[PDB]
């Protein structure tokens, strides 16, 4: 693909509806642990092991410790230059009657913290719960999410499992339910929300420029969004630290950290 920043900027100056797809690279640049491919590890596992229905069915206490740890570290984490460039772009273009929407695979809410308003969080959020019995979804920012997890979730290898009885895990407060809560995060092998995908499809159908930022482009169906957009002739520009299996399908590829390339790109 092309690496002419000047050429991309010509499309950027004219674009009326920009879709920005962001993945784990953007969160890692804030120092958020992504637990995918260094990574690194939570004590002996990575996300592929614990973000699964199987892992939650076997040891929900261990999965909750993992998600509790991830919620807690967010206190020390701030949006990076990439998040800020993306949020400022949205505000600046919106004043010109131009639309910018972020479709993120990330679950850490740093895009919102940076001020992004048009946001589709297609894999859920560390700060939402869902009841495994009644299905209600709720926001939850409490540290710790439940008394039994207080001080738990330590990440060092060799840390014993908290082994919290399921009744002491986060419980639904819908009157009459009290079912066990899970993180409202899409796990490997689960389907994404059809209403969310309907929103995604509307944005993809109407955009005139697409950016793919910090994404490995091997997690589906998210890996396939940008290819359907190029079909209508829409330019796709990829911003990643390395090539991906989808790189040769894009109009532009700008190699490097997203917090380095995006400020120039979206200036």
């Amino acid at each position: 693909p092309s690496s002419s920043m000047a050429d991309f900027r010509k499309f950027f100056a004219k674009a009326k509806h920009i879709v920005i797809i962001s993945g784990a690279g953007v969160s890692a640049e804030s120092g958020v642990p992504t637990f995918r491919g260094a990574g690194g590890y939570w004590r002996k596992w990575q996300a592929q092991d614990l973000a699964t229905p199987l892992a939650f069915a076997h040891n929900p206490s261990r999965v909750w410790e993992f998600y509790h740890y991830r919620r807690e570290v967010m206190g020390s984490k701030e949006p990076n230059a990439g998040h800020r460039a993306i949020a400022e772009c949205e505000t600046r273009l919106g004043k010109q009657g131009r639309r910018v929407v972020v479709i993120t695979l990330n679950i850490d809410e740093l895009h919102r913290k940076a001020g992004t308003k048009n946001l589709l969080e297609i894999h859920g959020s560390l700060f939402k719960t869902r009841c495994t019995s009644c299905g209600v979804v709720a926001e939850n920012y409490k540290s710790p999410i439940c008394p039994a997890l207080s001080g738990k979730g330590a990440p060092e290898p060799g840390t014993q499992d908290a082994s919290i009885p399921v009744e002491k895990l986060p419980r639904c407060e819908e009157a009459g339910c009290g079912g066990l809560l899970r993180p409202h995060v899409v796990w490997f092998g689960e389907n994404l929300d059809p209403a969310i995908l309907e929103e995604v499809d509307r944005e993809l159908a109407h955009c005139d420029l697409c950016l793919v930022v910090g994404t490995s482009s091997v997690v589906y169906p998210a890996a396939m969004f940008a290819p359907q957009v190029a079909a209508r002739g829409v330019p796709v520009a990829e911003f990643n630290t390395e090539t991906t299996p989808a790189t040769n399908r894009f109009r532009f590829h700008f190699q490097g950290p997203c917090g380095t390339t995006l400020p120039e790109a979206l200036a």
Partner: peptide, 4 residues
């Protein structure tokens, strides 16, 4: 679609 399913998350891979």
């Amino acid at each position: 679609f399913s998350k891979q």
